[PDB]
Every structure is written in structure tokens, then in C-alpha cells.
Amino acid sequence: AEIKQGIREVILCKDQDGKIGLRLKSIDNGIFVQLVQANSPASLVGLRFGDQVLQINGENCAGWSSDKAHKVLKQAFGEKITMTIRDRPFERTITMHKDSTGHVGFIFKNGKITSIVKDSSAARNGLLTEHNICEINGQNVIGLKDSQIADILSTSGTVVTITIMPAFIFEHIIKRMAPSIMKSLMDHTIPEV
């Protein structure tokens, strides 16, 4: 859940169907992860929604279109693809503690935080409104129903870490992607060890 500084290298191999499980999006002359498929090479190496791809196979992604990034992946030798990644650079993680009645202290609608409750852990920790909830305790919740998000908060331990993104950036990233895809095909698992 907590956002790593700097840059890391990941190494992927296409699956038996020639797939890595990734959709990419051009944002502000970089390339970002828009969708990670469950049970994919991308999910398994730990790519996340909102990760920035700096290089593919040692080539800079700066100023690439979304189409170009997809084409480069499609045309890469499948046995080893290297990517250089910056971790979720548009997001931040906020750690809160549930009160005696199980609340962290906010209202949300359609996955977006809309108000902060007075004298709550959310207030104390400076949770912001107009921010989309991306992850809870390192689990992606994008495309899940509000009731499902509430359930995940319920089943957390008392320490709840939420990864948020300014709504305007979130809405930019998810543009040209069908809601059914986010719900059905975005990875929502806890990572394996």
C-alpha cells in the first residue's frame, strides 16, 4: 500500500496466450497503468493501477501515445520484457485508525470521498475530498460497488490504509475504459507471497 520512492525494474514473461494483462494510458507525456488483469504476468510481478512506465526494454516511454505503448508490448520478444516503473506517482497513502464503533470518519459516493467527519481519524490524518479511492490495505477497489468498499473497510483490522488519487487525474486515467471492464477485469486481490 505505501508508495515506494524512486524507480524499480520489473521483468515479465507473456503468458501462454501471448498476454501480459496490461492496458496503458498516456498522461502528461508519460505512460501510466490504466488496468491490470487478475492472474496475469503483470499482476504477478506487482504492477498496480496508476504506476508510471518510464522504460520498456530500455526504451524511454516519454511522449508515447497509448497506442504506441501497446504496440511496443505486442511486438516485444515475449520471454523477457523489462520495464522501469515509478510507483503510483499520482497517489498517496493515508493511515487511519478505526474508532470504538468501527469508523475511520468519511463519506464517499461512487468511490469518491465527499466529506470528512469532525473529530475522526480521517480528520486527524488530513484525508481529502474530491479524491478517488484506489486501494484499501494494498487491495485495488476500483470498479467495486460502494457496498463492497464499505465491506472491505469493515473487515480491515483497526489500522486502515487508503490509497487515494485526485479525482481529476483519476477521471483522466480511466477515460476510454468501460465500467464493466474495471469491475470485472481489474485485479482486486491481495498479493501472494
Side-chain angles (χ1 to χ4, degrees), residues 95-99 103-104 116-127:
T95 303
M96 287 161 295
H97 300 257
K98 290 175 180 175
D99 72 10
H103 305 95
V104 287
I116 308 304
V117 172
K118 292 196 189 203
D119 301 321
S120 65
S121 188
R124 288 185 294 276
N125 286 282
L127 191 68

Side-chain angles (χ1 to χ4, degrees), residues 49-50 90-91 130-132 134 163-167 169-170 173:
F49 177 83
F90 296 128
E91 287 162 72
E130 196 64 7
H131 274 68
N132 282 87
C134 293
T163 300
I164 63 177
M165 182 184 290
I169 302 176
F170 181 85
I173 293 170

Side-chain angles (χ1 to χ4, degrees), residues 12-22 37 40-42 70-79 81:
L12 300 96
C13 177
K14 292 174 193 189
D15 68 12
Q16 66 285 341
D17 303 313
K19 297 176 169 169
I20 63 159
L22 207 54
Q37 204 167 17
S40 66
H70 293 148
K71 179 174 191 170
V72 164
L73 288 170
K74 183 177 65 199
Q75 301 185 347
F77 144 78
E79 187 204 45
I81 302 173

